[PDB]
Amino acid sequence: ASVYAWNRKRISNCVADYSVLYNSASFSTFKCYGVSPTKLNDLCFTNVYA
């Protein structure tokens, strides 16, 4: 979607492997603010939105 009508998707009730996101070189920018990128596989979350 466009930036004025940005699409928000809820993510819930799943087990997420973030290691395929860190190790992928396709992303020019992979920058996290409130959490470490390498610790995402060790933590549990709710209220996940994309």
Next chain:
Amino acid sequence: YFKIYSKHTPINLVRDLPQGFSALEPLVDLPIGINITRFQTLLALHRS
């Protein structure tokens, strides 16, 4: 998150609210993520 807290109490007062204390237990924690500004309750008709 839309939180619904509920409590059921056996009462015997005829018209107004009873005077007492009853804590409402949380019933449903609901993941909606939408804007709510106005509401309306639903009643049931009786047809004879």
Next chain:
Amino acid sequence: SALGKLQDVVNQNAQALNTLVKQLSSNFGAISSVLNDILSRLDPPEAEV
């Protein structure tokens, strides 16, 4: 209220200890008041801050 003088000392000591334990729950401007959350959530460059 006969033994108020001892009770005041006991209450003041307990209240000071209680406030000291309450001070652990304050983040003091950090992201969280829990050290374990910071250790599990951040890299050392931000964790040191």
Next chain:
Amino acid sequence: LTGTGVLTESNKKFLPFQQFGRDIADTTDAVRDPQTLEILDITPCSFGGV
């Protein structure tokens, strides 16, 4: 939720919504374990002055 302690049986009548418990320090003192739903009390490990 991370922490250190001894997990023991408990007699605290938790309500169905209730999952964990908190002390004055806000540190977790009892927890409900996933998968088995049991309530385990958390008591801090023994320490003192040598």
